[PDB]
Amino acid sequence: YVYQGLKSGNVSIIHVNSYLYGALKDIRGKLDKDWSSFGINIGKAGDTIGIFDLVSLKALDGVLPDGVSDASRTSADDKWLPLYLLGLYRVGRTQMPEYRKKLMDGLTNQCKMINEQFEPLVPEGRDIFDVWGNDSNYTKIVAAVDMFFHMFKKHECASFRYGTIVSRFKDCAALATFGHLCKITGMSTEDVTTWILNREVADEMVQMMLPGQEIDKADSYMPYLIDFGLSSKSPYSSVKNPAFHFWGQLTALLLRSTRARNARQPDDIEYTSLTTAGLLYAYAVGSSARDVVEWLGWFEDQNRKPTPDMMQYAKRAVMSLQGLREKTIGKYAKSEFDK
Amino acid sequence: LTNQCKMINEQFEPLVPEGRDIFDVWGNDSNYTKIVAAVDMFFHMFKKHECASFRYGTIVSRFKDCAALATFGHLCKITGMSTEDVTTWILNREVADEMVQMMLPGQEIDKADSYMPYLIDFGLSSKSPYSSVKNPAFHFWGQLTALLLRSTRARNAR
Amino acid sequence: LSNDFFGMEDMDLYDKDSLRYEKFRFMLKMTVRSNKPFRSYDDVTAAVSQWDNSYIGMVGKRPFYKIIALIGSSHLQATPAVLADLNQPEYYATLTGRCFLPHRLGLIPPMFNVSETFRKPFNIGIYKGTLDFTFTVSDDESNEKVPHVWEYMNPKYQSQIQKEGLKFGLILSKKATGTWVLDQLSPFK
Amino acid sequence: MDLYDKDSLRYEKFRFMLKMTVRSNKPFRSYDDVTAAVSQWDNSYIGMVGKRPFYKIIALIGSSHLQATPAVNQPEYYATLTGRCFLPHRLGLIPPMFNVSETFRKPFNIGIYKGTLDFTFTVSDDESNEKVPHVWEYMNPKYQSQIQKEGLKFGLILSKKATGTWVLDQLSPFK
Amino acid sequence: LSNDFFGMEDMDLYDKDSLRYEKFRFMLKMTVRSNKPFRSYDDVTAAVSQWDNSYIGMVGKRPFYKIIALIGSSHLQATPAVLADLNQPEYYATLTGRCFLPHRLGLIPPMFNVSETFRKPFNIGIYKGTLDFTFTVSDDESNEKVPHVWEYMNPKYQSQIQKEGLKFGLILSKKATGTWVLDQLSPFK
Amino acid sequence: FRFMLKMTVRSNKPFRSYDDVTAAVSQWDNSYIGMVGKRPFYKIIALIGSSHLQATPAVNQPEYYATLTGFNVSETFRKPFNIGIYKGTLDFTFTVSYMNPQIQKEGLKFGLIQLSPFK
Amino acid sequence: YEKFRFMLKMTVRSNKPFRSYDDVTAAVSQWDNSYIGMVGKRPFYKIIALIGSSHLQATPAVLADLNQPEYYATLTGRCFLPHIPPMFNVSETFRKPFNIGIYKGTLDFTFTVSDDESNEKVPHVWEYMNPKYQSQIQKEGLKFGLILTGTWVLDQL
Amino acid sequence: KDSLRYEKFRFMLKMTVRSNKPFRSYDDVTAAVSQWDNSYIGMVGKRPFYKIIALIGSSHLQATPAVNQPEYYATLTGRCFLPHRLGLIPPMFNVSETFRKPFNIGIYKGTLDFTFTVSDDESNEKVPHVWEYMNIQKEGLKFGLILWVLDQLSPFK
Amino acid sequence: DMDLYDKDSLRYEKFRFMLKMTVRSNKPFRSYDDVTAAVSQWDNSYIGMVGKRPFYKIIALIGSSHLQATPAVLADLNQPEYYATLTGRCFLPHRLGLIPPMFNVSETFRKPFGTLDFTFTVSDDESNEKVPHVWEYMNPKYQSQIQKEGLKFGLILSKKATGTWVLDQLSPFK
């Protein structure tokens, strides 16, 4: 069903989900440590576990489409077909021709490493896999696969992580940029949180740092809070936390980080105060190899106006950024901090 | 709409003729508005439903005839100032009256999964208190203020 | 089966072979070529039944495609090329309409108005040639009555249908009323 | 198989009506050609399925009573019959029957003969308790090999129970 | 029906077939092309009865459209082209007026003064060709008494309207007074 | 004790022999909710009802039927049966407050002997 | 009479499909070879395992040659067991491999045995097993380790 | 393990042979029909019974009254039992299976047509014998049968 | 011995096959035995997959069975070059235990005995459709005593008394 649907480009989501369940019942993979998360006993230190062992399984209530099954296909499916089906989710999540083309090339290279023939299945035009992300069960399956192969990194079928890696920390750009800020400065995470200002970044931090969320556990359900359906609106997204995302991205950009030049500028948020706070933090880090109230008093000695030296530092940190893409933090800084 | 429809059936020959539209009258009918607003509510509660594509077209019913709250939220989210203290900054004594008439407690205007956003499509209120014609002063003041802070949204409100 | 292993109780909606009627409007195109003209319709059934040697087409229509192939073989009128010595005899047939087929194959998944062609060479020994099919089997949620599908075969051909339909792989049984019901296809086909 | 008369003999009484109409290029020579022309009357049967065997037996009575019109342009045949009878059949339970008339027409090409047909079937059930004449008494056959042969090709099945009443076993079309 | 499942009690407005009279004016245009002239009016009914094989038209006027087709077939006068050998025989018939049809089809939706054309080829075997139609069936609230609809057929043709009127799918009956009441269309149609 | 009974059995097709009938009816108490003390009495009353099953004259699906009258709380029972070929539902009437037999086997298969349900 | 509601999920995998009910009991009775869950509800866990084995419906993969036959059974209800520490609505999984010779594989359980103070009438627990299976009730009960008016009463393990 | 089994079966038959020229001797007919199962699609359990049915059909081959190309014909419907040393065999069902394989034995070439309905019958009444339907050991031998009681099957041997 | 398959647990393995055949000789082969002798030495040095060795042997046997001669095989035209080609699906009853999975990989074999030329495509099949018996692909026209004919290819057969031969084992460690 799924093979001929992909070949004809008219596959049904129910059929691909059912086949993905059927071909991913690899109970193999032996745990070594307890994998409890959110008060759920997934496994106990030495029991074999499958991909779908960590998600409850029910029976879908609906009509099954016909299907275009080909009976001349051998049992060479699990080697490369589930990997392709999971990769066509990340490929379809791009919505831009160049990135989609690059991801398709990478997926074809990954698949050809296994079977070595791999005639491409989906037709070049009329991409139908964009809709797959809309469905909930497909996202649940892909996130379960990603987490299972993230715990078992050295598995034989660990190549399935391609395409499903996009599910990890999905719509969690605020936490990602918080970690990027904590790493690119070397400053402690307990100390950086005091430096945030503008009283909107403070509220976004408060809503991000609820104690009972265990956001500092890698082998947990947190990174897939929206693919598993745990939360329909992720509090760690870049749209629900635009002020902190903008401030952190700008601060990292002013500290000469290659990452903070492609994140897009959040829409309809006050920028002047956020830019001032980001410039203050960036100058403090780049000129003082860090206390927050000391720098606040130093700035108040200027009655809250950036000094020309700080503008020169920002100019140095933003000059010579070739190929800045539009609507991103790099473009905004080059337009405003490079007068 | 045509692109959305071809994503599902993939033939979708257009139905309504190009000229002589007849679907403008559909908004006048109360039952059609009730159905479309109920659909919008149901698919807003269940975002990840398999038929969530129906949100197109029915999204217009969400917060319909409620531009005053739209511009109030835009103002409170463009300045970073808290909604608790922005209201201290409104002036002229008719913007204050409009704020009073918008902020009656038992209206559930801060609840997303409530009947408030469709107060005029379900027929809950024939005259929406939260509109831009019943609250023109607040709309004008807040909209201009958002414009003065270089916001792209604040360039097309009449 | 249940006599061999443990715990294979049947379903509750359809017990084993719950008989059901499925109305559906169909369409058909036929084209059969051969080195020599087919002396009998029986050889026609032999030559056409090898159309699904390698099956790529639809699944909810496979028994329906078999019955439509049977009706196409029944109405294979000749062509002027089938005369004494002109070329390879190319047969042709086209049938279109609506019908309901009684079958005991269980509930069939909903079908859609899609047409797929079929091409496959055959070799029944003496005769050779290729094939060319075009099916348009899909449901019909209307209420108007439709002619019974087995009636579409004229009594002039198929002196005994119980095996002419079996040549294509079908398993037939008699409802003792005059309407044939489809039991199943060729074993696990 | 059922304990309570799964596929046993049944007696169904019914009041029916008939109006035959047959046209052809040239007049029929033998009764067999008439049978071949009439037997293709239900190539596309649209009417009620439950009345198909009764429709076939009324076609039998119509073909057996085909008298040419005094006009015999193209030779057109004609027949009609209305009566009351009961049919012994072994087809199991039958759905209830209503007083509705249904037309029929299917052109025939049996080679030598070509034309169309026209039927008039109003075969309906009734619950009157009075005794009614046998359905097969409407025939005028040779009991040896006449009603058993023409009826068989009309797709009907006949047999003997030693009582002396013709019984209906099966309906076998295009077979 | 009620013998099958639970709770299908009929409504109290019309019990089962509450007879009602529906006064309505109408208009009709017809054009029947054929390869050979129609020898008998029965062949005409056969060729016109399939005018709605694929039906797109009105539902509240579908029985009315059928009766108008019947009246048009009744008055299908020939043309000078129908003579010995000029061209294909082209027939024509048009009727206009007002009438009331007693029927037991339940309450009809309010009809509007809108015209719909119909085109469909027919294949009754020997005879080929197509049709043409233009109905203008609509309500008439005026108290003006109208002739009985079945009267519009001349007694010259239709020796048995019980079947000539049934050829188009109608089911007729007699009101024990000489007026024909329309029972219903062909079952499930 | 005096009691009252109203049998009601339904199946897709009418039963072949008494063995099919008893196999179908023996699954009436898969989830027994009534009084536990009356369970043997309930079994014997169900047995006497199964002995006197006479189908309705209309014998839609075949509807088996029977009646017999010979704390004072009436409790109903209904459990579907799936013995393979024969499948349907049940309906009892027990108000525990006659054979024509053969009996030692059919009654034992009801769970009678002590009582041995689902043996 | 210890009234209690329950829930159950089961999954049995074998190299070859099971011969009969006795082989199923042999492949399942080793589920508590190393017991880690709540010790108080052990007899109730055994009876729930018995009902799960009695209701082990097969899957399409159990056919001739598709994959390893993966049996499945789920049961949810409410009953009383004639035969305990106050149990609570807590779920625990069990994973243990079985080695009964001709058959190999593992298991999977989800027990939810807990109290029920509601007075609503409860069906008898031993009635949950259909009469079709378990020709000898006592033998199958003994296979799981269980020891057994017409209502069976649990003696001990 | 390998003893005689008096097995009851009711079947159906109609033989159909077409060739370029009429068959002279019965041996040529046997050579033409012995290749009827060059590609066996039907159930293997009914193969010996199918060859028995082929024997009964070939023994009663009568040409049609028309004899264009010579077309032979037969038809047999009956009830009987076959004694065989074939061991246990799966029970049969009431299914019909057709066959066709063209033959080229030199002078004679053509096609075939079968309709076999070998089905079990559990009636306790005594039914006739399969070998009484004949009018033989060598005919079985060149059909691959070994011999009346059947011993074993020897195709292409 | 183990408990899954003790010694000779009989199993059926459905599999598709394809075959190309080409045999050359100084003189045309008269009888079938000469052809089998000239073909049986194809695996003198074996390089291909070991799990398909019995199936390769049976396909070589069936190709030997259907060696239809070419027009060059006539009285005196050129070196007689034989040819055969058999495709389809079949299942082989054998008692060789569980066999490793097979993939769609063509495998040529070019060994002299004249020379030979093979192309096997023995691969697995997971379809449920019924396939003809593999020993039944050999027509009764040749192989008067097919036990010896199929045994001198390295195989050892045994009649099941039903008419379907079962493969016991190959030649010792072949």
Author numbering:
A (entry chain C): 54 to 342, 373 to 422
B (entry chain B): 160 to 317
C (entry chain O), E (entry chain N): 41 to 229
D (entry chain T): 51 to 122, 127 to 229
F (entry chain R): 64 to 122, 127 to 137, 152 to 178, 192 to 195, 200 to 211, 224 to 229
G (entry chain L): 61 to 143, 148 to 212, 217 to 225
H (entry chain U): 56 to 122, 127 to 194, 201 to 212, 220 to 229
I (entry chain P): 50 to 162, 169 to 229
Article passage:
Like other negative-strand RNA viruses (NSVs) such as influenza and rabies, vesicular stomatitis virus (VSV) has a three-layered organization: a layer of matrix protein (M) resides between the glycoprotein (G)-studded membrane envelope and the nucleocapsid, which is composed of the nucleocapsid protein (N) and the encapsidated genomic RNA. Here, by cryoEM and sub-particle reconstruction, we have determined the in situ structures of M and N inside VSV at 3.47 Å resolution. A double layer of M contributes to packaging of the helical nucleocapsid: the inner M (IM) joins neighboring turns of the N helix, while the outer M (OM) contacts G and the membrane envelope.
The atomic model contains 19 subunits arranged across three radial layers from inner to outer: N layer, inner M (IM) layer, and outer M (OM) layer in one intact and two partial helical turns of the asymmetric units along the helical axis. In addition to the close lateral interactions between two adjacent N subunits in the same turn, the single-stranded RNA threads through the cleft of N subunits. Each N subunit accommodates 9 nucleotides of RNA. When the in situ and crystal structures of single N subunit are compared, the main body and RNA-binding pattern remain the same between two structures, but there are significant differences in the N-terminal arm (Ser2 – Val25, termed N-arm) and an extended loop (Leu344 – Tyr355, termed C-loop). Adjusting the conformation of the N-arm and C-loop allows N to adopt to different subunit numbers per turn with different diameters. In the in situ structure, the N-arm and C-loop pivot outwards, which makes the ring larger to accommodate more subunits per turn. The IM layer bridges between the N layer and the OM layer; there is no direct contact between N and OM.
